[PDB]
Amino acid sequence: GQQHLLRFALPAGKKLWPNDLREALAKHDLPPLFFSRDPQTGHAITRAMRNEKRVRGYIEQHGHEPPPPTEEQRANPLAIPGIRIVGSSTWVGILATGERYKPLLEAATLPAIQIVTQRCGRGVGVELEQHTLSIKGLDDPKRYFVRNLVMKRGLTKTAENTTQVASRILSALERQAVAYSLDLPPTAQVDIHVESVVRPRGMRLVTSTGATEQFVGLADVEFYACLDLKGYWFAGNLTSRGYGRIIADH
């Protein structure tokens, strides 16, 4: 429920994209869960099962019943990244969602200062924010953006992409609300409207093991909803790299 954001203000002349900070932090001997890798699988965090039909299918495949969830699978059954590297053109930062992940932020803090000050030179500002994730309905529409929404599949350049993007935002807000035990208002109250899907484009998917041949869909979004979102909410894929951050217009 509690979010901690270590935020660095970048000097006017300087870029340090969230992926750049993430890549540089990977050279600093941090725990795998900082990078959303489950330390008990050696692979990226993934969702948990729960079904009696899924058990049956698992038994047919493997010849035994599913093992217990790992510690991260039990704590994080919807596989939402507890650490995200976030930012925009003017700042970069580390977001911990939940007290569980705050020690990972703490371990990365001096490394992050080293990286940002070495890349940017002098003039880096620092803030440390704390927020309570909350979602509450409104009577009138509130304007939001999504910065660099990533959709691994399904983002087109044609007019129906506004509806597709709207559905992806609803799906993501429902997933976070379930994960954090928050109440979403009725959809007819929320009444999401995607006003603009800005410059729908491609982005080559790069992993820690190198650049792939997959491209993902990437766009910027303006939308309205009768919702007051407090804290940092996300939509789409690849959010541990800061994609899909929802931003209230001010």
Partner RNA sequence: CUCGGUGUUCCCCGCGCCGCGGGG
Positions at the binding site for Mn(2+): 191, 193
First to last CA, the chain: 24
Q: CB under 5 to 8 A by kind: which of RNA, Mn ion, none does 79 bind?
A: RNA
Strand arrangement, sheet containing 125-132: 83-88, 91-97, 2-9, 125-132
Q: Choose the one of Mn ion, RNA, none that binds residue 191, judging by a C-beta under 5 to 8 angstroms depending on kind.
A: Mn ion
Instruction: Return the structure tokens found at 204.
Output: 């080559």
C-beta of 250: minimal distance to RNA in Å?
A: 3
A 10 A CB-CB count for 51 gives: 9
Does residue 148 come out as left (phi exceeding 0), alpha (psi in the -120 to 50 range) or beta?
A: left
Tell me if 191 contacts Mn ion by CB under 5 A. Answer: yes
With beta carbons less than 8 A apart as the criterion, state whether 111 and 119 touch. no
Q: Does 195 bind Mn ion (CB under 5 A)?
A: no
Binding-site positions read 191, 193
Please, which residue, 171 or 189, has the CB nearer to RNA?
171
Residues 172-201: x where in contact with RNA by CB under 7 A, - otherwise, as a string = --------------------------xxxx
Only one residue has tokens 């929404």, namely 149
Name the token pair of 64: 């035994």
Instruction: Give the residue, chosen from 24, 44, 107, 138, that forms a contact with RNA under the rule CB under 7 A.
Output: 44
Helix (H) or strand (E) run with residue 62 in it: helix 52-62
Using CB under 7 A as the binding rule, whether residue 88 contacts RNA is answered as: yes
Neighbour tally for 88: CB within 10 Å: 15
From the list 17-25, 118-126, 184-192, 223-231, the region that binds RNA by CB under 7 A is 17-25
Which spans of this chain sit near RNA (rule: CB under 7 A)? 17-19, 35-37, 41, 43-47, 49, 54, 57-58, 66, 79, 81, 87-91, 145, 147-148, 151-157, 168, 171, 198-205, 207-209, 212-220, 222, 237-241, 243, 247, 250
